[PDB]
Structure 1
Amino acid sequence: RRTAFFFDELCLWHAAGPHALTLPVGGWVQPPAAAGHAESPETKRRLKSLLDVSGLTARLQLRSAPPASDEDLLRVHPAHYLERFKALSDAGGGSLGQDAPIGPGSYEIARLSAGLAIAALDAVLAGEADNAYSLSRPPGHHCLPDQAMGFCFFANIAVAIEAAKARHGVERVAVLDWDVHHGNGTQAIYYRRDDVLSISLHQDGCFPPGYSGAEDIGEDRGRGFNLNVPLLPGGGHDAYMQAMQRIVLPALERFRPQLIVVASGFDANAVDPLARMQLHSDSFRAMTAMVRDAAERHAGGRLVVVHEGGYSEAYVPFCGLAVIEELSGVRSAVRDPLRDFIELQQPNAAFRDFQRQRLEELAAQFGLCPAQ
């Protein structure tokens, strides 16, 4: 398999003002001696370094892209949003929204981040590669058209899909969002649309806080083309396998996508500070294998994975590597040193049974229960 890896070093130069994890410095929050904001360059940089040291980089088709044009950005965001962002970026940064801090030059880097997503979809639709991975930072799946949130400043995936519709005329795109938080940006933009099926697996009530959303299935022309799977906090490998087999694959089977796009955050990993789930690198490998199979059956193999969250410096690189190995069909020498440990921590039989029953009920609510 021919996998394109879209990456630009400048995406690792985006940096907010001083934060302790997600907490802006000031008042009772002391400036950190070392760390900084949870969305730090180093998580993404360490994925890139492990790809290089593993030699996977040599087996990929390495590519960059021009930044997103105004035309592409304006298909989803208003001009005054672009101005406000630009102005705040030139004045050293600050807070652009709710949990949406930016640094100096963040505007140009966010444009580049959106450009990589655009180019990755384009490459896979033009037949330049069988599938693709876009290491775009800052992420996109929380961003609303006129509102930055959750560390996201442009709706990278939506911007990329609208650019793909204009240039190629792809009619049916599925967005599977396994970032551990709710993909509310993507949900909102495509809520009354049937040309995009948006599916979000997420920790129930995590982010946005208190939101589950099982009953929000889309509206009018979009009714039945948005699916939320609020997994109980503490869930791990089995919960996600169960969700994939009962909800996600049946839903994709029904929808018949011509292109699958994955909002791939790795913040469901077992050591992430920003969620409470218990995935290991083989979970992400297994999920990628399942969605790639769906892409091969319906979409001519056309699958793009766009990097979103993941806030464990130590463990995100192994999770990301697992996805890219699975995308490319190349198994590197890297062994995940936390995998066997995380297997031992999984939910017991009773908790697994409890979550499994909830997913059976949910699959029944969505009218996805087999039979076939």
Structure 2
Amino acid sequence: TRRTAFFFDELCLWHAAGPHALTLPVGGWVQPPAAAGHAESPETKRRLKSLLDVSGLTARLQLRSAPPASDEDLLRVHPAHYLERFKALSDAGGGSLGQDAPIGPGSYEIARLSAGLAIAALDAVLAGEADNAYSLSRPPGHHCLPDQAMGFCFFANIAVAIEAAKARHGVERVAVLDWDVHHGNGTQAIYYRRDDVLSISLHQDGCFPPGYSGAEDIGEDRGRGFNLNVPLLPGGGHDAYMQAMQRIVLPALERFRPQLIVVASGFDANAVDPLARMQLHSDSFRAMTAMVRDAAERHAGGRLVVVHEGGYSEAYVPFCGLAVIEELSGVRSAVRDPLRDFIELQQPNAAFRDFQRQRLEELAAQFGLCPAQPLQ
């Protein structure tokens, strides 16, 4: 069976912003919550860890921590003045580092650790210490720009990890598949003119950043054709994502021949997430993980890293994350998803499924993707 490293540090669960109601800063007409604060709360990630423990999964993984990201690692993406400004605000008790990017006291150090876990997870897999890895990187990364925090992200975790991996191991082709329900704009921007990183984002059309679809943004010059956005219709579920995987993602990976696959794995496409309108269940995440693991085994010697991004349902994210880790490790626990059958009944009807399928067929043709089968 497979050796799966689980990169985790309890301190990542200690990052916390000032009072928010969901994503709204408290103040003006927004009353402070009586309990549940900012949507990016420790509790989703903590409940995943707890379920991994009680299920017996954690005992079957290689549990690892890592040193925090060095200034050197961070400076490959971010300027010194960004680091200074972030640290100053963190030392002064927190506040607003960007639009939709609130920080708390000591968040700077915790963000460095989150980035460090992602760096170390790529390193372990490239070094052959594990077949694959899951990094519980909080705070998340995939919206962060080099000089602009956004969407709850303060460092560009995956980009920092990739640039570190290139410096240490000399990997030439990395694919980043971002199935967080929101657009991976940070990864897209950083690698937009680069052909050494294929960035693919599956996202709800127009969700975040708001109004962005992006199908026509395929990269430029050297990077032309090495960025793919799949703007799925709000309301879609299992079939929409499976069709996207089969018609766009897998053909794109086949042409690119990645030596390493990184997944920006948010769980906010789940059917009860407040921050998007998609209808995935735990078995959808399982199936996506199975597909990308297979692609990694065919092109990249099994080298796959999954980095935790979003997911805002305290109740349901634990089941979705568990499914991914079971699939990475090849270990099936006794956990049974209590919402699975219910979510199956809520799925788009045949007319809606056909409508989305036709759009994905059109998009695959627009990308110039050939419907080949998996081989090698």
**TM-score (structure 1 length as normaliser):** 1.00
Residues in 2 aligned to 1:22 and 1:214: alpha-carbon distance in whole angstroms: 27
Instruction: Tell me the residue number matched to 1:50.
Output: 51
Whole-angstrom distance in 2 between the partners of 1:293 and 1:327: 10
Equivalents in 2 of 1:236, 1:98: separation in Å?
Answer: 29
Q: Give 1:370 deviation, angstroms.
A: 2.8
What's the offset of the Cα at 1:351? 0.1
Post-superposition offset of 1:167: 0.1
Matched, 1:220 2:245: no
Q: SS of the residue aligned with 1:96?
A: strand
| Alpha-carbon distance between aligned partners in 1 of 2:371 and 2:66, rounded to the nearest angstrom | 43
In the alignment, what sits opposite 2:137?
136
**What is the CA–CA distance in structure 2 between the aligned matches of 1:98 and 1:298, rounded to whole Å?**
39
Give the distance between the partners of 2:108 and 2:371, measured in 1 at CA: 48
Deviation at 1:147, TM superposition (A): 0.2
Alignment correspondent of 2:203:
202
Offset at residue 369 of structure 1 (A): 3.4
| Residue 302 (structure 2) aligns with | 301
Kindly state the Cα deviation for residue 260 of structure 1 after the two structures are TM-superposed.
0.1
Deviation of 1:83 (Å): 0.2
The aligned length equals 372
TM-superposed deviation, 1:295: 0.1
Displacement of 1:76 in angstroms is 0.2
Q: Hey, what does 2:356 align to over in structure 1?
A: 355
For 1:107, what is the secondary structure of its paired residue? helix
SS of equivalent to 1:336: coil
Deviation at 1:212, TM superposition (A): 0.1
Describe how 1:64-143 pairs up with structure 2 within 5 A.
64-143=65-144
TM-superposed CA distance for 1:217, in Å, is: 0.1
Listed one character per residue, the Cα deviations across residues 278-307 of structure 1 (whole Å, up to 9, x for unaligned) are 000000000000000000000000000000
**Partner residue of 2:346?**
345
1:80 Cα deviation after fit: 0.2
Match of 2:248 in 1: 247
SS in 2 for 1:113: helix
3-state DSSP of counterpart to 2:244: helix
| CA deviation profile, 1:218-251 (whole Å, cap 9, x unmatched) | 0000000000000000000000000000000000
Please give the secondary structure, in 1, of the residue aligned with 2:272. coil
Secondary structure in structure 1 of the residue aligned to 2:98: coil
Cα offset, 1:193, TM superposition: 0.2
Take 2:27 and 2:249, find their aligned partners in 1: how far apart are those partners?
43
Distance across 1 between alignment mates of 2:219 and 2:278: 26
CA offset at residue 318 of structure 1? 0.1
Residue identity over aligned pairs, in percent, reads 100
Task: Name the structure 1 match of 2:278.
Answer: 277
Name the counterpart of 2:167: 166
The runs of 4+ residues in structure 1 deviating greater than 2 Å are 369-372
RMSD across aligned positions (CA): 0.8
Deviation at 1:208, TM superposition (A): 0.1
Query: What does the per-residue CA deviation read over 1:254-286, in whole Å, with 9 as the maximum and x for residues that have no partner?
Result: 000000000000000000000000000000000
- Gaps in structure 1 of 5+ consecutive residues: none
- How far does residue 324 in structure 1 lie from its aligned partner after superposition? 0.1
Q: CA deviation at 1:150?
A: 0.2
